[PDB]
């Protein structure tokens with residue numbers, strides 16, 4: 001059942017892929033990516049050749065992690081795995097991994113948008129996040145360039161886990177953050193789509209926190225009550241007490257429902273931040289929300305993350321995942 005492969009060089013890089021995929025066009029560079037034509041399905045795909053996937057234990061575990069995540073994602077607003085292949089015929093010669101995904105038109109970084117456009121884009125991000133989060137997965141690095149959009153405005157999240165979109169508790173190095181670090185990111189993205197301007201374009205990590213605190217205000221007593229780190233509490237009590245800004249004044253002219261949702265996403269205290277599922281129910285998405293079509297994910301076994309294995313063992317687990325792959 002093994003297909004016939006064909007070879008070619010692209011940007012000082014040889015590509016060995018099933019004849020199924022045709023007209024490989026480089027799209028730039030973790031991995032080299034080519035645009036291609038899937039003759040089996042008539043669709044345009046992206047083919048990613050991982051670079052040095054098994055170079056070290058850290059790379060090998062990262063390769064396995066990326067394959068396991070992509071094999072799990074089955075949702076309209078999350079990038080899924082169409083195919084995965086290696087030219088190798090055995091574990092012994094297994095050295096290269098190629099991942100095949102839907103070719104998306106552009107990303108949000110390249111795409112000021114109308115409020116109706118922002119509504120539909122953020123709705124789709126949140127629907128994808130509800131699904132990812134329901135599997136106990138956190139994206140951790142959501143940003144416009146990790147959001148693919150086609151000309152129909154259909155959106156998919158990709159490239160799971162720049163400082164401009166990171167939750168303050170990650171900036172301050174909290175070990176026990178929750179899934180709503182991603183909701184902070186969505187809030188930064190949505191703000192940028194509405195205004196045309198990065199919300200918090202910090203020049204470094206200290207400037208980044210200062211910009212965030214200027215908007216959302218310095219932590220309240222209820223939040224300090226929950227801070228364990230001794231420095232963190234002094235640092236918080238030490239810097240100039242900014243007052244929380246009225247978001248309606250900052251996002252002047254925006255739809256009041258958008259301002260209200262932003263207020264619920266950009267909360268400094270992550271215990272109080274809105275979840276993806278809750279945000280889908282916000283009135284801002286009234287014309288798109290469908291509680292019967294915002295599904296959750298099957299459970300995802302992340303137990304491998306806590307394991308310390310040899311480089312060859314991670315490579316063998318990755319090989320098993322290539323062989324066991326079942327296309328959609």
Ligand SMILES: Nc1ccc2c(NCCc3ccccc3)nc(-c3ccc(N4CCOCC4)cc3)nc2c1
Pocket residue numbers: 168169171172173174175209219223226227228229230232236268269270271
């Ligand atoms: N229940 C909650 C809710 C929120 C929380 C939150 N939010 C970050 C708040 C913040 C305040 C000012 C500037 C940036 C972020 N932050 C931390 C937190 C932040 C940093 C640490 N450190 C890092 C230094 O080494 C000791 C451990 C430990 C805990 N806990 C929270 C617990």
